[PDB]
Amino acid sequence: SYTASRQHLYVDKNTKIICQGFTGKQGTFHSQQALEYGTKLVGGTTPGKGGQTHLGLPVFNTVKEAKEQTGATASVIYVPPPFAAAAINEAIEAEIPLVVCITEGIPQQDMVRVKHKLLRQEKTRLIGPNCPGVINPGECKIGIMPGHIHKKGRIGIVSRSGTLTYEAVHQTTQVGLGQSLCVGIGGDPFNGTDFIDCLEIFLNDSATEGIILIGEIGGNAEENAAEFLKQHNSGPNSKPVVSFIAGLTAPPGRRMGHAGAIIAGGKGGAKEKISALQSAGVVVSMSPAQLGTTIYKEFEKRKMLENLYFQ
Amino acid sequence: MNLQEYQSKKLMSDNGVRVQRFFVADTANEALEAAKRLNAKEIVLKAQILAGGRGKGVFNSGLKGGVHLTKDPNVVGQLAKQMIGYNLATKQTPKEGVKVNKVMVAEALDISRETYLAILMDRSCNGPVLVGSPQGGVDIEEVAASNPELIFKEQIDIFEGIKDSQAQRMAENLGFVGPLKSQAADQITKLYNLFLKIDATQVEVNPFGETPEGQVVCFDAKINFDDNAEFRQKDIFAMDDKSENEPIENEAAKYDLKYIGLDGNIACFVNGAGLAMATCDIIFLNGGKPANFLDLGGGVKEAQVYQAFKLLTADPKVEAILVNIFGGIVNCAIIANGITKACRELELKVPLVVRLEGTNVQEAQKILNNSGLPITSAIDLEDAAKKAVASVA
Ligand SMILES: CC(C)(COP(=O)(O)OP(=O)(O)OC[C@H]1O[C@@H](n2cnc3c(N)ncnc32)[C@H](O)[C@@H]1OP(=O)(O)O)[C@@H](O)C(=O)NCCC(=O)NCCS
Numbered sequence: 001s002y003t004a005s006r007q008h009l010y011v012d013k014n015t016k017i018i019c020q021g022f023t024g025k026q027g028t029f030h031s032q033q034a035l036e037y038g039t040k041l042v043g044g045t046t047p048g049k050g051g052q053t054h055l056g057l058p059v060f061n062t063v064k065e066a067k068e069q070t071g072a073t074a075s076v077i078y079v080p081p082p083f084a085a086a087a088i089n090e091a092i093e094a095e096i097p098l099v100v101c102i103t104e105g106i107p108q109q110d111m112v113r114v115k116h117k118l119l120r121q122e123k124t125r126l127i128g129p130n131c132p133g134v135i136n137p138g139e140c141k142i143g144i145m146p147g148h149i150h151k152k153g154r155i156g157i158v159s160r161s162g163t164l165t166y167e168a169v170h171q172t173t174q175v176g177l178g179q180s181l182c183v184g185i186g187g188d189p190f191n192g193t194d195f196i197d198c199l200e201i202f203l204n205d206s207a208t209e210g211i212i213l214i215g216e217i218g219g220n221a222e223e224n225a226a227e228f229l230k231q232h233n234s235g236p237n238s239k240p241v242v243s244f245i246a247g248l249t250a251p252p253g254r255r256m257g258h259a260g261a262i263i264a265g266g267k268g269g270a271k272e273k274i275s276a277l278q279s280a281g282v283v284v285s286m287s288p289a290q291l292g293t294t295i296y297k298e299f300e301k302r303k304m305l306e307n308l309y310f311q
Numbered sequence: 312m313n314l315q316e317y318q319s320k321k322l323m324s325d326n327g328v329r330v331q332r333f334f335v336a337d338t339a340n341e342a343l344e345a346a347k348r349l350n351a352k353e354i355v356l357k358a359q360i361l362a363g364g365r366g367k368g369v370f371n372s373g374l375k376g377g378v379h380l381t382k383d384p385n386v387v388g389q390l391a392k393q394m395i396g397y398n399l400a401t402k403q404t405p406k407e408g409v410k411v412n413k414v415m416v417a418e419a420l421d422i423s424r425e426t427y428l429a430i431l432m433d434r435s436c437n438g439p440v441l442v443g444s445p446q447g448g449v450d451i452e453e454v455a456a457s458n459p460e461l462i463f464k465e466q467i468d469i470f471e472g473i474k475d476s477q478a479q480r481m482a483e484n485l486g487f488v489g490p491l492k493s494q495a496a497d498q499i500t501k502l503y504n505l506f507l508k509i510d511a512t513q514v515e516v517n518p519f520g521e522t523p524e525g526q527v528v529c530f531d532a533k534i535n536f537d538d539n540a541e542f543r544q545k546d547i548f549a550m551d552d553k554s555e556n557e558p559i560e561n562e563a564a565k566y567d568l569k570y571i572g573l574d575g576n577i578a579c580f581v582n583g584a585g586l587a588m589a590t591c592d593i594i595f596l597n598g599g600k601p602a603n604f605l606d607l608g609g610g611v612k613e614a615q616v617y618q619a620f621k622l623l624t625a626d627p628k629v630e631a632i633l634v635n636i637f638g639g640i641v642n643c644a645i646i647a648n649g650i651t652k653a654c655r656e657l658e659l660k661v662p663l664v665v666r667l668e669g670t671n672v673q674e675a676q677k678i679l680n681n682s683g684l685p686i687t688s689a690i691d692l693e694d695a696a697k698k699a700v701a702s703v704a
């Protein structure tokens with residue numbers, strides 16, 4: 001099933017990337033930045049421009065050609081909303097192991113169609129759309145997150161918000177813990193990777209020693225992940241999980257920027273998510289500024305408990 | 312976006328969905344004529360505003376009731392003249408009501424039984440699902456709380472489309488028997504196809520009704536549209552009725568800005584939906600009241616930043632401004648440039664707390680420094696919120 005592609009989320013120094021929308025405005029700028037950052041970007045696609053060279057790299061008409069000629073195992077999509085779903089579909093058809101879609105504004109009906117194809121295969125893992133991307137600090141960066149804030153370390157971060165990811169990265173770098181792998185699953189209601197997907201990778205990753213889960217109003221993915229953590233991250237050797245849920249002050253029945261961020265039919269409130277996570281044993285930072293300090297304190301408490309009772 | 316009743320019902324009626332026959336009137340004389348034109352046994356006259364509770368509402372003309380039934384077109388004319396150009400206040404409007412520019416004149420149809428029927432893009436199910444209940448006329452959330460067993464659902468495969476068996480079983484689930492089952496099943500099919508054609512996130516029919524004469528009719532409906540498909544729904548979005556939105560939100564929409572007015576005095580100026588929500592939240596957590604949510608998106612341009620900052624500076628409720636930016640795809644200098652350009656127009660008379668991080672922060676900081684603006688800096692988001700709250704203590 002599609003769950004078999006979860007491991008593709010864990011990009012590393014060996015991941016080779018192509019850019020879909022290579023010659024566009026953001027495709028060009030962020031491809032330049034990836035090259036200047038040392039990430040193994042090896043080419044890209046723009047239909048009708050196959051054969052050109054861009055940033056010293058080959059341009060192809062199709063993902064299939066790009067993959068065959070470069071050995072790329074990941075693609076990043078900077079394609080505008082009207083055509084970005086067909087761009088995801090092309091990368092799925094080409095069996096690209098990881099597809100990261102940055103694009104904001106893809107129609108939900110388009111993504112429902114994309115999801116139908118995605119769930120019926122297992123070669124391709126989709127992150128997004130409307131997401132900042134994924135980073136394994138010092139090994140591989142795919143997306144738009146800012147520079148000079150990450151530090152390779154011990155904390156796995158999964159977030160429905162890109163800007164909140166930057167905050168949590170900055171905070172965990174500043175308290176000296178760093179990040180093992182950071183996945184922004186984006187703010188759209190129909191996407192390729194949920195919280196539980198990332199938690200499974202985090203819980204089974206020896207380099208990840210704690211987890212930050214960043215959520216917000218709308219849907220029930222935080223509730224589902226909480227029950228998942230209650231059942232499967234509650235024994236000995238469990239890993240500390242800290243969470244922040246945006247939208248405590250959001251008015252009901254309004255989309256708070258994100259298509260997915262809405263309290264509808266009395267469902268989706270932040271309080272109910274905080275309470276589910278807490279009752280699952282997740283430590284919830286009430287403040288978005290205190291994610292670094294909260295998980296640092298949780299590590300120190302685990303240290304003391306392990307030395308007190310589990311020598 | 313929002314559609315008036317006559318706009319959603321035409322859209323449904325033009326796509327084969329059965330609604331009560333109607334005309335739209337701008338004047339009492341047109342309402343008179345429309346009423347004669349219907350040749351209906353009974354006529355229902357309906358003021359066109361978006362807020363609910365029209366039937367029990369009151370006009371500032373003195374007229375009680377925004378929904379009236381009669382058999383007599385003259386009565387339609389007399390009542391319409393008490394409606395058009397006046398303000399209709401209801402339990403869901405502000406005390407001063409909503410100006411009525413149009414009335415619907417429709418055939419009044421009796422309803423034998425009321426059911427609920429909706430189609431929605433359901434995040435839980437990865438696609439469209441039909442949602443139906445024999446308990447019509449009540450908010451669906453209420454049924455779910457009281458009697459969730461009376462909520463029936465069908466998952467519709469996006470590429471197969473709705474199946475006859477699925478429309479038939481939902482019709483049965485809603486209590487349509489014999490000849491009205493096939494009729495309701497056909498209406499469900501047409502509503503589903505409407506839902507797809509218009510990039511709705513929800514088409515909600517309540518009540519989905521059966522008349523004594525054996526007709527299945529959509530008596531009232533509410534449609535939510537996917538903002539992401541405006542580029543392929545230009546005609547529908549051109550019909551957007553903005554006249555009951557909060558004014559500053561209407562101003563922000565002119566510049567493609569995501570602004571939501573709140574009940575506070577500390578304005579927020581943030582990039583990103585998550586960070587903007589959290590900025591409002593951390594103000595509340597430190598004992599303040601945020602004045603607004605504002606989400607500057609990835610592709611924000613300097614002219615939009617400028618217009619956005621002016622939504623705050625021209626708001627008389629705003630007593631302080633908290634700028635908090637963690638730039639990723641957003642370049643911090645674009646923010647600084649738009650802010651300084653907006654402040655060049657006014658004598659800044661409220662505290663301005665500014666926290667900047669991320670892409671090109673050094674250049675943005677220099678731009679703010681060169682402006683000579685009275686800015687109090689913050690080291691982190693907690694520091695910013697505490698200073699913004701204290702600045703209006
Ligand atoms: C996707 C996005 C970045 C594109 O913006 P942009 O780079 O300014 O767009 P441009 O029109 O300049 O470039 C798009 C390119 O895609 C190309 N393209 C179109 N369809 C394509 C397809 N199916 N495959 C590949 N490339 C395609 C176009 O040809 C164009 O390149 P060209 O100008 O050389 O022809 C933008 O729409 C967007 O989503 N911005 C916000 C992103 C964001 O904030 N995400 C959330 C973060 S948490």
Ligand SMILES: [Mg+2]
Pocket residue numbers: 162163582583584607608609
């Ligand atoms: Mg954003």
